[PDB]
Amino acid sequence: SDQMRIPCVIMRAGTSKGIFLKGNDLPADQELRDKVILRIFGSPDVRQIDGLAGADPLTSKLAIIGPSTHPDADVDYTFAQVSITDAVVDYNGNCGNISAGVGPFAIDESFVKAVEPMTRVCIHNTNTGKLLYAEVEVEDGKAKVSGDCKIDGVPGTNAPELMDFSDTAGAATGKVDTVRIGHPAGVIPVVSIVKDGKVEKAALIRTARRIMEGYVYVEKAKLV
Amino acid sequence: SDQMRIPCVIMRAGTSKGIFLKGNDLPADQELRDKVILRIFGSPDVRQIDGLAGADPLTSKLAIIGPSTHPDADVDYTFAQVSITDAVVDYNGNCGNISAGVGPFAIDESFVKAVEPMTRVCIHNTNTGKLLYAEVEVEDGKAKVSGDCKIDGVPGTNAPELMDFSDTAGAATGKVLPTGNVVDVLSTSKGDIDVSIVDVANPCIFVHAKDVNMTGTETPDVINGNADLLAYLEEIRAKCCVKIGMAATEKEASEKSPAFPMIAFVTKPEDYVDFSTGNTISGDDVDLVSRLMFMQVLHKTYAGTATACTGSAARIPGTIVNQVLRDTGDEDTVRIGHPAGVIPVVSIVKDGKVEKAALIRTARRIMEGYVYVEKAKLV
Amino acid sequence: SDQMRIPCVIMRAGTSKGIFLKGNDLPADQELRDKVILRIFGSPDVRQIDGLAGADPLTSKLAIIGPSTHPDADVDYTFAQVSITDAVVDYNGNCGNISAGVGPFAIDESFVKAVEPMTRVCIHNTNTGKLLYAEVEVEDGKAKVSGDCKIDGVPGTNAPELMDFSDTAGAATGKVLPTGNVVDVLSTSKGDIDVSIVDVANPCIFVHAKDVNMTGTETPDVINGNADLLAYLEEIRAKCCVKIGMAATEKEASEKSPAFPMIAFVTKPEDYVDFSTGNTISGDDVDLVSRLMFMQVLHKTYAGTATACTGSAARIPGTIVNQVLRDTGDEDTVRIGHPAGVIPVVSIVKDGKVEKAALIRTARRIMEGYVYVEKAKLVGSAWSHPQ
Amino acid sequence: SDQMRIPCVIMRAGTSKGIFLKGNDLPADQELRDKVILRIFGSPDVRQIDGLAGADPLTSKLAIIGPSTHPDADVDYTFAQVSITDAVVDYNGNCGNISAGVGPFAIDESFVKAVEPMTRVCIHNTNTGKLLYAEVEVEDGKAKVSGDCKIDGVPGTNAPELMDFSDTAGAATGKVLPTGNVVDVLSTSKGDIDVSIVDVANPCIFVHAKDVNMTGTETPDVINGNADLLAYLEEIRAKCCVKIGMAATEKEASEKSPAFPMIAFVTKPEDYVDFSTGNTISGDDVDLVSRLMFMQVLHKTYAGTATACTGSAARIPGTIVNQVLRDTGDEDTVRIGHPAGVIPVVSIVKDGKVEKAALIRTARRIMEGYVYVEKAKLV
């Protein structure tokens, strides 16, 4: 009676931790939808002590997953950066690491039919409108977790997943092979192709796994 | 098939977030039990990115609940701090904050029969051997969550829980007054100073604000920008550490016991500025003003175990805390004026015996479900 | 340990209980899939004591739900009647009852975006190839459960769901009117008799109650009473079965095919007695009285598929059902007078093509969580005959 | 928002199926409790189409589990028979089969610490005040499921569990022979009949098969299929219920106490068909043939309690059971032939008192999760 349950899963998506929710498990009204996300995350609060998020920007992001609204997509995906300090749910942009969780989650939730060795998943990003391509290793109707692929920022080794960003060209503007990078915590290669105005492939190897599934509670009285 | 499922609860307990597991859901082999815990939390990792914990010691604490092995206790409770950067599951002391979630957990899981208005849950701490008494508000078979009691560290208000720490008297030491004195005069690099050493919940050393050259109502920014004060308080801390048996040497105390005993400096109730909010706390709302150090640095509020210890000291005739304390007549509450507010503690000590050391906490179940552990990482 | 967990939902779907699973949560290997399904249900075992099924075929049904395999469909849906008594998972037909829960399941699981006050769900049935159209009441991202609608076989009242079988027009024969004619003269051991054969959801034969020496308003004791009427109705049924191409022989029709086509005798709205409560149903409540045989015996109420078929025939001008129907005008519902109450159906036919043939159903989620199946009983044997 | 969630477990316990709820998960108000239970089960309704239960008395059973309320017991267990046909939840007895899931449930839920090979669980049956003891095979913190033990009425083979019903004499009356007699003649609408009433684990009424026009070896279909036998068995049942203080009227007995006492009709050993397989159970394999009625209808196997009670009666010189029983010689086992085969019970009555009442059982968790209940059905 004091609280309400919401189904909810938590993922490591690449170098991030995401909280994953199904479109229908959230309020239709945007005002209430935002209050409820803030309550799940434990925002606004520097410690995020009364909610699921872990007080770092890398561990305070949302993926809402729903039925595809695009004839060429298996699944719709809405990303949000949930502010730690402010009452703000920011829907501006795509998260490349978080989109690495989407495919495996879509398979494990039967939004996409599992095909052994490898399932191609096509993701419709809402914030952008653009399509992403995930190539997912599948074993027994579920996403493979184990294997020998190292990405920097995550201890140990996991099943590789290829993300294709090639149709991201246009992001905000509407206008536009393995190359290294010495980012904050190591190194990272990508399969770029530079040809003026068309992007052939922008593909990189990510990694993901499900950490938890269950129900978050959210206090009713705090939705005054 | 790749991953393994373990039943699991996440709670806010006081100003902490903990993971609450049941005894039987964990392997009995200590060595592998700990490999699982580390895997559940995501350690070792600065970022704890491949686990449930939030990469801060406040959000990296474990609670294993099981059947009571003590005839007066309802539930057994084993605490552990799970290291972030290392592969250690440290079961050493207890944690006063996390214990706040145990009563609500026991009720919601039906370890204890729900009784309306309030359910008394007696918790046997495993790490320590001591009992804690919880007074939980209950409604419709569950622990009440909503209400209008406020605690520092947690936004908003909630339902109160009464945590009595009376049985932790002589925690670290075996005695409420380890030194046998109500005030000890301590030799110091800067001359003699008066100190009062009390051991309830955790050992605490008390000093007059004047004797360390402060008004007592200073601000965290003023206090932390005083290398000289800090060097001095640590010096005093370390000497009493040696004095009460917790280290052989001041170096050892400073290096290997940085946390306990704690040190606080006290004054009489007077008006002061709430640092966090720029507003004035009237001296009429507090029975004394205190400034607690924790980890060679000012604690921005007041630690739970320091609260129980301060209140206990208040009631022992002759301690620095008792001298400074505004007489409370028949009120058993003492009101401690910390930097950002006032925290009440119910404190009854008759004849050197602690009969109540009870503070108000709060707790809330955040999530329930199953954690996943990768089978290959347990090799 | 000893057991493996599988996600799982139990639903009430129409007057049935179904176990609803998701495509990727079952094994791909067909032989192993049926194994796991059977362990879930507790079959074979006449009591089904070691699984979730209720040991009655009403409560031993399966729905596998996964992503759509059809351009116009939101979701794919596979049905199966799990056998109580033998190690068999029977994927033959479809169940208009079980599919009543598909729509709500799809919404509650976010396979179809929730729309208030109502979501249309397009269901692609695997066993059959046809599409089904669910109109579902939604509130706060979920199928409504509470409401004022009453269905027989379910205590109390619930939120109504519209289930449209109009895409099962000519499913069994390829044509709505398997003969081309709205009425046919059929030869009989008792003379010629008029018959209308319509094929929506399932083929039905329709007969004037008068032409079988009935008033049309009798009772399950009275009808089942005289063996001449029972015998004569099987004759007609078996002969039509042959005529529309589903048997080569009356004998074969009535032994290898006793369920379909079905047969009903019909009259205009009238007062008549409900056998279950000696009460009286006014003729203004109904748009025709009708009496349905199923398995050589009177059906005590009305079969789902017959309902959809009857409503359709009623709108096809000429047919016996259509001749005997009360005008409805603006109202698309036709109310059918069966022997223990009045079932309704939404029926629109325009220019020989059927647009709505919709039953009113009800559904509700009963439980969600994890079924356990014991791994040792899944182990692949050399040969397993329990005899 | 239309529906409420209730945590919930389904188990096969022995040869029955049960729903296991924890104490704090059901409302405190008895009337609201009983309305919730009915919604969870789907009652009343011949089909139980809108609830969890299976529309057969053996699949409409409830166990509620809570903390122990008895100084020698690890856990509390309250049984209820949920009526299929009526709005009735019946707490007047124990259930032997269901009680077999209680040990496994208590361990899997951490009310009892798991001990490898075998964990002893002492169980306080609420309804009756008596204690039963269970010995459970544990592996990896949970009750074992897999094994080589066969119990007739459940396909395949499982981990065995030893159930001990020795502390359960006079479960409802306070006396092994509540009338004082081994045999009483009862007045009846068909004239005088001999009955033995024995109260061990639960009270049972034993009758000669022939005194009711049966050969004793009939089939659920054959027995469930004649109204008169059924109406007459209930008359006997109801009358002995009143005669023993569990009811005021015979009408009340059939309406408010339809579960207990139970009634069985018995015969000397004979060949009979096992309805569930079709196989012939040989007369040399049993010591007697019993047909047990439960909820006005044949009990399709045999009750755990009725098993304890039937064996005890076999050892009391004079009872109908005793009269019909093949001499066992040195063997302490009595082999009871029920409709689905054979159940053995180690049964020693030393002239007055029950020293052994022991059987083997088997248990399995089938599903964990949340039942939903429609809020509007409760207002």
Swiss-Prot record, chain C:
Its EC number is 5.3.3.6. Transmembrane segments: none annotated. Inhibited by oxidized glutathione, p-chloromercuriphenylsulfonic acid and iodoacetic acid. Not inhibited by the chelating agent alpha,alpha-dipyridyl. Activity is slightly increased by EDTA. Not activated by Fe(2+), Mg(2+), Mn(2+) or Ca(2+). Unaffected by K(+), Na(+), NH4(+), Rb(+) or Li(+). One of its GO terms (molecular function) is methylitaconate delta-isomerase activity. It holds the Pfam family PrpF. Induction: By nicotinate. Pathway: Cofactor degradation; nicotinate degradation; propanoate and pyruvate from 6-hydroxynicotinate: step 6/8. Gene3D superfamilies: Diaminopimelate Epimerase, Chain A, domain 1. InterPro entries: PrpF-like (IPR007400). Optimum pH is 6.8-8.2. It catalyses: 2-methylene-3-methylsuccinate = dimethylmaleate. Keywords: Isomerase. GO terms for biological process: nicotinate catabolic process. Belongs to the PrpF family. Catalyzes the reversible isomerization of (R)-3-methylitaconate to 2,3-dimethylmaleate. Has very low isomerase activity with itaconate. Homotetramer. This is 3-methylitaconate isomerase. It comes from Eubacterium barkeri. The gene is mii.
